[PDB]
Amino acid sequence: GAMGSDEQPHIGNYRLLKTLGKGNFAKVKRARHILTGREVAIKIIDKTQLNPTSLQKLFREVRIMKILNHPNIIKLFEVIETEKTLYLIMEYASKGEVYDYLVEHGRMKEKEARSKFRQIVSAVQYCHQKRIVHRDLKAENLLLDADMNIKIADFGFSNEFTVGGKLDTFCGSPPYAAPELFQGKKYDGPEVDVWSLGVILYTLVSGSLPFDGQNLKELRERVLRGKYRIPFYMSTDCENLLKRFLVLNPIKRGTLEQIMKDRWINAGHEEDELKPFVEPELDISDQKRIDIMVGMGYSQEEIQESLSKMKYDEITATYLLLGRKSS
Amino acid sequence: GAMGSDEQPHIGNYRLLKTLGKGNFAKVKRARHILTGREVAIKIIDKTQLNPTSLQKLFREVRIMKILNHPNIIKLFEVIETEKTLYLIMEYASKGEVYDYLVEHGRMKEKEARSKFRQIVSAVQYCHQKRIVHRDLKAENLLLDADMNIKIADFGFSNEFTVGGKLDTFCGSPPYAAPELFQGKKYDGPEVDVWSLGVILYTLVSGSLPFDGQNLKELRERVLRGKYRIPFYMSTDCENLLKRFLVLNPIKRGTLEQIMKDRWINAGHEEDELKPFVEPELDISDQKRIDIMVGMGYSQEEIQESLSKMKYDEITATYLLLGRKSSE
Ligand SMILES: C[C@H](c1ccccc1)N1C(=O)COc2ccc(-c3cnc4ccccn34)nc21
Ligand code: NI
C-alpha cells in the first residue's frame, strides 16, 4: 500500500516515476531506489496475458540477463515478482537511443565514434563468446547513459517483451539486415551481427544509414548490391575498417576478435589494444557497503547468504547500487 | 582563550583578519588557518537575528555548498557553530570579482577569456547536473583566485546572507536576465542560466555589457530585441558562439552539453575537448598529509574516523588545507 504521505507509487524498495515507454506485454518506468537513492529503470511485465511458452521464454530471457555482466550491456539489479506481475530492476540509460542522438546532433567525430564503437564491439563479441547472437539489431538495441557510455539493450531477446512489442516488429531492423536474408541463405550465425555492426559504425561516423531505401524493395536492392557512399571527411582507415564488416559473402567477413586488432579501432590506444572482454570476479566482501546495509537493518548473515548465492533480491541489488554513482 | 589585547582574535583554528564585506545578516572576513598557514575566507552569520524560515534558507545554502564539489566553485572546508553564531570556512579568491578586474584592466584577450569561460561553463553545467539552477547568474557570482582561476560564489543561494544592502541584489541582475523575464511566462529552467552565460561571455571578451539601459524599460527593450554590437576585434568563432547562448526563444537556445563542443570553446584544446565535469573520488588516504597531521597532535584513529564520513570539522579541514598551495 501507500509508502509515505502524498508520495509517488512504489514497488518493493523503489519509487516509480515517469513511464518511458508502453507496449503490448511490457511497460518501462524510470524509478529511484528508496534505500540508496540510485536511479534505475523498471520493466513491468503483465504475466496474466502470457501463455506457457511466453512464460518459459520470459524466464530464460531473464536468466540471460543475469548471465551477461558487461560495462556496456544493460545490467539487471533486482527481480520482484508478484502473482500477476514481474518487475525487472535494471540500469537506466538517460540519453536514449544512439541513432536518435545522431539524428539530433549529427555525426560523431571519429575520435568519439571510436570510443563508442570500441564499447559496441566489446559488448557484442562478449555475447558471441557466450553463444548469444541477436540477428535482429536495430537502433533500439543501442542506448547512451548520462556519461555517453554505450548501453546495449535487449540483445538476444525477442521483442515480445519490448515496448515496441509484436506491433513494431519490423520498423527498425531492415536497415541493419545482412544480405543473406534477401538471398534466401541461412540467417542464424554471428556473421549476421557482424554485418549489422558495419552499418552501426557507418551511422556513427556519417550520421546516416549506408543502405537507405525509400521502401523495402529499394533497401533490399542496395543491401544485395553492397555498395555505399564514402563521405569526403571519412578517413582511409575508417573506410578500410568498414570493408571488414560490410562483405556480401558472410564467410569473408572478419570475426569480431580479428577486427579488434584493426588499426582504426586502436588509434590512440597503442598500449590498450581492444581485446575480448574478461569478466572480473565480483567482489562480494566490500566491508564498507556491508556495514551500510547493516545500518539499513539487514543482518550480516542475511547479506552474506544473499550475495554468496547471487539471488537478485533486495540485498544484492542494494549492494550493487551502493557500488554505482549516486544522484 | 584570548590572543592578546592588540592582536586579531581567533575562532577555532583560524585567526580572523580583515573584513571583506558585511551584509544585513552576514559578515565575510579573510582568515588564516593556524595549523597549516593557509588563507581562507570565513562567513560569520549571527543566528540570533533569524526567524525560522531564514534559518532554513541558511541551512539549505550550507547543504548546497556540501553538494557542490568543483574546482571553479567556492568550496566549504569547515563549519564552526555556536548557539548564536555560524562560521563557514571556505575558499578565498584573492584576486576578487571578475567585474572589478574587467573595469580595472579592460577586456580579456580571447585566449584568456577562453580559459575562464571553460571554467565557468564547466561549473554551471555541473551545477545543473546536481539539479541546482540559479536564475540570478550575474557578475557578482564570479570571483578570481590567486592564479586567475574562476571561483563561482553564491550559485543557488538567496540574497539573505550576502554582503551589501537588502536592495543590492537587484543592482547587477537585470542586464543578465533572460528575455523570458519580460514576457510573463515561467522563469525557472536551465535555459535561463544559459542566456546569462552568453552575457558573461560577452563581458569577458568586450569588457562591457551587451544589453544595457538607463532604466528598466530601456533595458527590457534591448533584451527583447536581442541585438548587440559585435566589436571589430571579436573573432567570427566567438561571434558564432555567442549566437548559441543569446537566442530569444528559450526552446531554441543551445544546451550546455552541445555548446561544450563549440570550436571557439576548444581552440588550443583540440585533443582536450570540454566535457561535463566528472567529480573524482576524494583521496582520503594521502599518508603524507596524514603523517603531517599526527605530528600536529591528531591521533591516527580520529583522522581515519573524521575522513571516512565528510564531517567538515577541524580534522577534515586540516587535511584538505594541507592539499592546497602553501602561503607565499
Ligand atoms: C562575493 C561576495 C563578496 C563578499 C565580500 C566582498 C565582496 C564580495 N560574497 C558574499 O556576498 C557572501 O558570500 C561570500 C563568500 C565568500 C566570498 C569570497 C571568497 N573569496 C573572496 C574574495 C573577494 C571577495 C569575496 N570573496 N564572497 C562572498
Ligand atoms: Ni505498498
Swiss-Prot record, chain B:
Residues annotated as carrying Phosphoserine in the record are: 326
Q: How is it modified after translation?
A: Phosphorylated at Thr-169 by STK11/LKB1 in complex with STE20-related adapter-alpha (STRADA) pseudo kinase and CAB39.
Domain spans labelled UBA: 284-323
Tissue specificity, in the record's words, reads:
Ubiquitous.
List positions binding ATP.
20-28, 43
**List of catalytic residues:** 136 (proton acceptor)
Point out residues bearing the modification Phosphothreonine: 169
Cell location: Cell membrane; Cell projection, Dendrite; Cytoplasm
Q: Show where the Protein kinase domain sits.
A: 14-265
Quaternary structure per UniProt? Interacts with MAPT/TAU. Interacts with DLG5 (via coiled-coil domain). Interacts with STK3/MST2 and STK4/MST1 in the presence of DLG5. Interacts with YWHAB, YWHAG, YWHAQ and YWHAZ. Interacts with PKP2 (via N-terminus). Interacts with CDC25C. Interacts with KSR1.
The record's disease note says:
Visual impairment and progressive phthisis bulbi: An autosomal recessive, progressive disease characterized by poor vision at birth and development of bilateral phthisis bulbi by adulthood.
Purpose of the protein: Serine/threonine-protein kinase. Involved in the specific phosphorylation of microtubule-associated proteins for MAP2 and MAP4. Phosphorylates the microtubule-associated protein MAPT/TAU. Phosphorylates CDC25C on 'Ser-216'. Regulates localization and activity of some histone deacetylases by mediating phosphorylation of HDAC7, promoting subsequent interaction between HDAC7 and 14-3-3 and export from the nucleus. Regulates localization and activity of MITF by mediating its phosphorylation, promoting subsequent interaction between MITF and 14-3-3 and retention in the cytosol.
Similarity comment: Belongs to the protein kinase superfamily. CAMK Ser/Thr protein kinase family. SNF1 subfamily.
Q: What protein am I looking at?
A: MAP/microtubule affinity-regulating kinase 3
User: What organism is recorded for this protein?
Assistant: Homo sapiens (Human)
Its encoding gene is what? Answer: MARK3
Q: From which residue to which, out of the full length, is covered?
A: 48 to 370 of 753
